[PDB]
Ligand binder design. Structure first.
Ligand SMILES: Nc1ncnc2c1ncn2[C@@H]1O[C@H](CSCC[C@H](N)C(=O)O)[C@@H](O)[C@H]1O
Length: 327
DNA sequence: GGATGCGCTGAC
DNA sequence: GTCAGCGCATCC
């Protein structure tokens, strides 16, 4: 994550729904905002969240009386994506894990914050012939909010990962916000190789599979794209090896394969998956952020998370718009 | 819970 | 056909 000198969100209160690691919290607090409520029902996510923020998020949002939620200016929510992801069954709103957006709407209807800041996977924008995105748009409009949505790729914002996500920013209409803009892309100057830990700290992640098939030669020049070098087994998810001179593939939460949830990388002549701390870095988390003691849970958590830097640029722009109040 | 072989869609 | 994918199935 980056340092933000001009704290555009100072004096603003926000809530951290589907909190996870608290990615939205890091991003908004870096702009000066204050978190006044957090919600996350996973046992291990609550533990790591508490480890880093000193609070245990409240459980199951579907059982929370929206009236008990503290007043706030901005509502943050990177809601569940298993039901919308290209990697899933795409049952969408029909999936028991796909109706969480309506809980968000329920809370918005009651608390009417100035801004609603949501995130989900790229496929969310095309799911069900665009009807899924349309439903969210119309729901927000019905609640009297504007609706700004765009898919942003983390590689365009200084983080070496091909993570494409749809970001939805909604402003309460009475605010008459007409100048919100998504951050402009800029040249990537950091690559996977730049975030790796020393070999001595990741030896246990090195695997030598006899069914390794290197399909492409290593590149010497860094490039802002994923560069597959080979595969193991049948080349499915978690069975693909990439160049550290390129960018990381999208980290996943329930991913399988031998290089599960992070993908495999060619590092100093050896093939290995990423260490949880490298996952943190690939997600824009500062080294000061404490990862969960269970490596399996840590991989899951970062795989479900958001790239801090991207949220920071968006948050700064939300604040920039909220603060432009000329006579 | 932890680990890993795979399905199979969206977007080229 | 090629590649990527906050995933799924199944085993202990
Ligand atoms: N009913 C529910 N109540 C509370 N949290 C829920 C929930 N259903 C799913 N979640 C939580 O929703 C999260 C979605 S992933 C979002 C992660 C978050 N942006 C962070 O930065 O890491 C998961 O952590 C999941 O456990």
């Amino acid at each position: 994550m980056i340092e933000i000198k001009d704290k555009q969100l100072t004096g603003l209160r926000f809530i951290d729904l589907f909190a996870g690691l608290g990615g939205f919290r890091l991003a908004l607090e870096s702009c000066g905002a204050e978190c006044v409520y957090s919600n996350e029902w996973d046992k291990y996510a609550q533990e790591v969240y508490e480890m880093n923020f000193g609070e245990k998020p409240e459980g199951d949002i579907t059982q929370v009386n929206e009236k008990t939620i503290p007043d706030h200016d901005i509502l943050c929510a990177g809601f569940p994506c298993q039901a919308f992801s290209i990697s899933g069954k795409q049952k969408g709103f029909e999936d028991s894990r796909g109706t969480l957006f309506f809980d968000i709407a329920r809370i918005v209807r009651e608390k009417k914050p100035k801004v609603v800041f949501m995130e989900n996977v790229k496929n969310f924008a095309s799911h069900d012939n665009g009807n899924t995105l349309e439903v969210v748009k119309n729901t927000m409009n019905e609640l009297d909010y504007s609706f700004h949505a765009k898919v942003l790729n983390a590689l365009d914002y200084g983080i070496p990962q091909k993570r494409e996500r749809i970001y939805m920013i909604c402003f309460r209409n009475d605010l008459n916000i007409q100048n919100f803009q998504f951050p402009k892309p800029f040249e990537l100057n950091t690559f996977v190789k730049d975030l790796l830990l020393p070999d001595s700290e990741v030896e246990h992640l090195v695997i030598d599979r006899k069914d390794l098939v290197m399909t492409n030669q290593e590149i010497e020049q860094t490039t802002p794209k994923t560069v597959r070098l080979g595969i193991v087994g049948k080349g499915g998810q978690g069975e693909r090896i990439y160049s550290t001179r390129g960018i990381a593939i999208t980290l996943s939460a329930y991913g399988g394969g031998i290089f599960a949830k992070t993908g495999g990388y060619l590092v100093n002549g050896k093939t290995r998956k990423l260490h949880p701390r490298e996952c943190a870095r690939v997600m824009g988390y500062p080294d000061s952020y404490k990862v969960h003691p269970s490596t399996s849970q840590a991989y899951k958590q970062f795989g479900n998370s958001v790239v801090i830097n991207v949220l920071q640029y968006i948050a700064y722009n939300i604040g920039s718009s909220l603060n432009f109040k000329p006579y």
